[PDB]
């Protein structure tokens, strides 16, 4: 029984009377969850994991792609767009017959290499597929301390995934009918930046600095996300200007967006009038380091995102699939 890639199936507690599009998708693609799900510990077993070379992530990516293509599909670029209810629900990925999922329960597993307290499970934990850049919202948190993960930290081209241990509530709200904004506690964010700098400090050998994004598509320069069917784009300049030994971020709703899942563009109706508000738990970050021209005085980190595989990766890192034979 060695790691093998195969199509998993998904389970969820989606609600069939609900037209909310995650519920509609899940009703068709997923099955109800097992009432008493078993989890078995594997004594005297070491097994290797690699979140960056994990097929589970790809399958989830493909699944969420078909989810958006089925549920949302407004119009543009070659094509009706009723408004829809949008709020991710937790999805479990489950192994068919003849396969099994190994789960790493090791404390502070950095994402790659040997895991010695390995167990087997029928299904993953419930994972809500939140689409976001630079910040990870409504995700899972490491219990002991913040955990940062990378395929090779010394490769500046390679993304860094930060997992928080304390979450930071962020409230975004729309009472210019397109003007919105997000609020979070400054002191707690300063302390968050601190707990990240301490772990970055474990690697460096180097004084750390945070900068806002250098550029690129709107989706990755800002904290881009969905809320009530509307697409928010928040300036994160205020979160990421810092140098180490309340915060209102101005946001805009955009009708014309890039589709994260394929080349082209999607165009939606302007947002509905009335009340739009999202209170989300910031639970992680995706960061990128400049490199190439560092200097003994500054290491620069910037908010990242764009490849949603990393979003899934932040939840599926503890899991691997094997052909039980």
């Amino acid at each position, epitope marked *: 029984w060695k790691e093998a890639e195969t199509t998993l199936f998904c389970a969820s507690d989606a609600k069939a009377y609900e037209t909310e599009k995650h519920n509609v998708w899940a009703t068709h693609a997923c099955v109800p969850t097992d009432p008493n799900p078993q989890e078995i510990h594997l004594e005297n077993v070491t097994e290797e994991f690699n979140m960056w070379k994990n097929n589970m992530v790809e399958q989830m990516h493909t699944d969420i792609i078909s989810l958006w293509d089925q549920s949302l599909k407004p119009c543009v670029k070659l094509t009706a767009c009723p408004k829809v209810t949008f709020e991710p629900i937790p999805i479990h990925y489950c192994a068919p017959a003849g396969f099994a999922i190994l789960k790493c329960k090791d404390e502070e597993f950095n994402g790659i290499g040997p895991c010695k307290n390995v167990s087997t499970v029928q299904c993953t934990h419930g994972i809500k597929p939140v689409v976001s850049t630079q910040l990870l919202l409504n995700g899972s948190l490491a219990e002991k301390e913040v955990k940062i993960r990378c395929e090779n930290i010394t*490769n500046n*081209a390679k993304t860094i995934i930060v997992q928080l241990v304390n979450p930071v509530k962020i409230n975004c709200t729309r009472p210019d009918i397109r003007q919105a904004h997000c609020n979070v506690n400054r002191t707690e964010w300063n302390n968050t930046l601190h707990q990240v700098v301490e772990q970055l400090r474990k690697h460096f050998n180097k004084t750390i600095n945070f900068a806002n994004s250098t550029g*690129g598509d709107l989706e990755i320069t800002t904290h881009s996300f969905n809320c009530g069917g509307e697409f928010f784009y928040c300036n994160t300049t205020n979160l990421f200007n810092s140098t180490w030994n309340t915060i209102i971020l101005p946001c805009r709703i955009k009708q014309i967006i890039n589709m994260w899942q*394929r*080349v082209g*563009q999607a165009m939606y109706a302007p947002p509905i009038r009335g009340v739009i508000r999202c209170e989300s738990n910031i639970t992680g970050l995706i960061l990128t380091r400049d*490199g*190439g021209n560092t200097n003994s005085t500054r290491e620069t980190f910037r908010p*990242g995102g*764009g490849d949603m595989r990393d979003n899934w990766r932040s939840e599926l890192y503890k899991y691997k699939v094997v052909k039980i034979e």
Partner: antibody
Amino acid sequence: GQLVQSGGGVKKPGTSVTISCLASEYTFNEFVIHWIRQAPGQGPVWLGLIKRSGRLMTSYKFQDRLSLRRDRSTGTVFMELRGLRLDDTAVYYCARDGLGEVAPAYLYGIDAWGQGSTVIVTS
Amino acid sequence: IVLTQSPATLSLSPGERATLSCRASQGLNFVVWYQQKGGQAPRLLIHGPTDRAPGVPDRFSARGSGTEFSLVISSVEPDDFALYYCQEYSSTPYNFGPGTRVERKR
């Protein structure tokens, strides 16, 4: 074959040149695309890349004159090189690379190249 | 990082074993290799991590670890006389080696 391009040609010194690189949907969606130039009788020089996430990265040695961008509407990537000099004269390639980021195998290696765009800076 | 290649030129007769060298300023996991003929773009020979890309014939092999890498051609064919570059991925900017020219011995 996979990556088409259409860069400029003769440029007067001081001007700027923009080179586009039309990519297949798959390459554009899944791969990194380097911008690499090669002057006559010399080896290749890495100028910058665009990751599938949209991340732009440029060579420290060109960052003041070089701007990269991608067009998610059409699946095209671009490089602009400004303040052209005679020694910027080279064949410019866009070329793709999984960079250990594609789903199967996770391989590095520049396996597909555009046809190249010759840029000759002179008056 | 920086990569240097040796020799500058390799003179060889057809049938002979070619071995090209690539040296790295710091520790690398691997390096990739390209073949280039005049007027054409580089053609990938060796993927990273090793071994060899699709379409590449069997006579091509590659090896090394850490600082030192080499590309080996077991039995040189006329088609193999060309310029070969090695290339590194440790961080941007990604450096190419200066190239080793393979010519016909005389």
